[PDB]
Subunit: 112 residues, 4 copies
Amino acid sequence: TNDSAVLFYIVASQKKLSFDYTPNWGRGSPNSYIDNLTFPRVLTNKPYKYRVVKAGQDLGVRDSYSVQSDGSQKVNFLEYNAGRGIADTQTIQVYVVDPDNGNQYLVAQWKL
Amino acid sequence: TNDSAVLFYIVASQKKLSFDYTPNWGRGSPNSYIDNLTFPRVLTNKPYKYRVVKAGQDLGVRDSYSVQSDGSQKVNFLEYNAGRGIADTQTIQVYVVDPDNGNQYLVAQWKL
Amino acid sequence: TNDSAVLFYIVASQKKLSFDYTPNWGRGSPNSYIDNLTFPRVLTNKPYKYRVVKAGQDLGVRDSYSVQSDGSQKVNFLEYNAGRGIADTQTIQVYVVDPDNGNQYLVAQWKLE
Amino acid sequence: TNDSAVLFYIVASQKKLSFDYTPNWGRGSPNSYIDNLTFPRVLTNKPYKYRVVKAGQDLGVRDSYSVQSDGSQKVNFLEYNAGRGIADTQTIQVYVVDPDNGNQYLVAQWK
């Protein structure tokens, strides 16, 4: 199906845009835990937050780590999971949360 | 800003479509309480669920009532609010939840 | 691909919407000719125009006919093809034209077989 | 008015994307003529074409110039306008044309 109309709506309204939500999953100690997730280049037109779902459990929406100098942004699952990383046998879903209307969009999923 | 390209992407992909999410807020007793919300004609291509947020407090997701033969669908806030209606002095935000990815989209908002 | 986000953007911005662009191809005399196209329920948020392309040849834009009381709108190819229908052996493409920015979107195609 | 749903649809389906359609208009000689337009980083998933409209006159579609090694792509108005630049007192509209369906999307406008 041809969705180029949607892409050129974004081109027309933003003109110059670069993003990279390729998930970079950071492991903890021991290595079987997933401690965090980094996106190399997030969108910055709003102060987006992130919601984390662990094995079907909503861990909530927390304060974002500041966007780093390279444009990356990191989500630290220890802030969502009571100070512990997430066992890599569990599904992890990460949603961006629009601060203006509260919408949320799946941007990463860990599932071994 | 001109979004006709998005509108006609939906036309080209769907061809014939009718929906009606005009919020019909159902009042309780006393009349100052809002007990529910009915949409006259919801989308039916998935088994959508609804999340309710009351004055910024996330009430979560519940099972949906069936789409009615006239196309309407009811969201009963008593199912979300521990058996109680919501005072109309509080903000009510209702999100449709996509079951394929868990995304949520604001479709109705009460705010005095 | 899951494009429900695009649909609910339209839901959120329009709230109540009904359209039907199922093509209804009207034939002339001889019945071999395609003389017009009717859409049962067009969008009406702007005074859209239509461009017609006849077997790859652009026939340009013309003023649109009024949207009818039942919601339908007719595109009359005699207006685009100097008073004659289009032989049904030719492909026909019909684009809606946004009057604000001049964008064009394919909304109907006639092609035999 | 909030279109983040559309933006994150593109994020979710494309994951990593960079484009730049900031118009770099090239003037001719004399300087009052607009001879061309360059986009620094175009989309490349289709062999897109360009339509040019000058002062309400549709000049049609032409062969696209190749996307260069740096990602940029140029629209030469002399190819559309019979060997002449466009006087800068006229409106210019440039549309990207989807080769799959012939749709056209405005990407640059002079006045």
